[PDB]
């Protein structure tokens, strides 16, 4: 409903909703990570099996996509994937209705457009940084090889793909949020159960798809 900000005024305007959500989500992720990996064995112990299977699936999807040097951006891609996964899981699994935010509302990190735009700019600038590191510093992939008319078209498409990823993430998050909000606002909360299950499945699928799309832009940077 109200998705703007809370005026925690420092320097300029700020949105406290995504700040609180990002702090909570990153804290929960790092706290789950460090607790079971403080002493990991070679055998897959309690949290070790889950963390190792996650690292295995991420390394599989990364080594398949980018090609050879899939090791250097593996923590970046895993950070993007797990951040989106945990945000999409926790924005739906965490109740924000019994507790009241005075200034606005606050449910999930990627509900604001700024979160998706920042992750998109991070991925796009990382792709351009890998293109500058791998290809020549004079002209990167904006060079018009096949015909002499595709330079600004390729530059505009490269500028558009980040915003495409950000729009995909914002669309999924706002779709789940509006679905839960309107389904609860219709009537008492017993009706929307199968749609909520479908939304959870869509959240997991969107997490895997965001991981794959980040790996796709990374393979484009590898090109």
């Amino acid at each position: 409903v109200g998705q703007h900000f809370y005026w925690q005024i420092g320097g300029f305007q700020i949105h406290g909703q995504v700040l609180i959500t990002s702090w909570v989500v990153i804290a929960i992720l790092l706290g789950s990570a460090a607790i079971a990996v403080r002493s990991p064995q070679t055998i897959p112990t309690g949290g070790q099996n889950f963390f190792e299977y996650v690292l295995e699936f991420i390394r599989d999807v990364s080594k398949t996509q980018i090609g050879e040097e899939y090791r250097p951006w593996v923590p970046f891609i895993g950070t993007m994937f797990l951040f989106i996964f945990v945000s999409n899981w926790s924005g739906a699994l965490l109740p924000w209705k019994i507790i009241q935010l005075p200034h606005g509302e606050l449910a999930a990190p990627t509900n604001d457009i700024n979160t998706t735009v920042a992750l998109a700019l991070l991925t796009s600038v990382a792709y351009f940084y890998a293109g500058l590191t791998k290809k020549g510093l004079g002209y990167f992939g904006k060079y018009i090889q096949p015909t002499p008319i595709l330079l600004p078209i390729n530059i505009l498409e490269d500028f558009t793909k980040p915003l495409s990823l950000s729009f995909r993430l914002f669309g999924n998050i706002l779709a789940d949020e509006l679905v839960v909000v309107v389904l609860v606002s219709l009537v008492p909360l017993v009706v929307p159960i199968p749609v909520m299950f479908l939304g959870l499945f869509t959240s997991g699928i969107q997490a895997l798809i965001f991981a794959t799309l980040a790996a796709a832009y990374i393979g484009e940077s590898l090109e």
């Binding site: 320097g11 949105h15 979160t115 920042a118």
Partner: peptide
């Protein structure tokens, strides 16, 4: 609406990246 929550989230995410690398991913 593009506020400073974008840099707040990016800063909190890079710490989680390096923390996952230090805690679980390298070990």
């Amino acid at each position: 609406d593009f506020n400073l929550t974008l840099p707040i989230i990016m800063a909190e995410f890079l710490f989680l990246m390096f923390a996952l690398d230090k805690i679980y991913y390298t070990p």
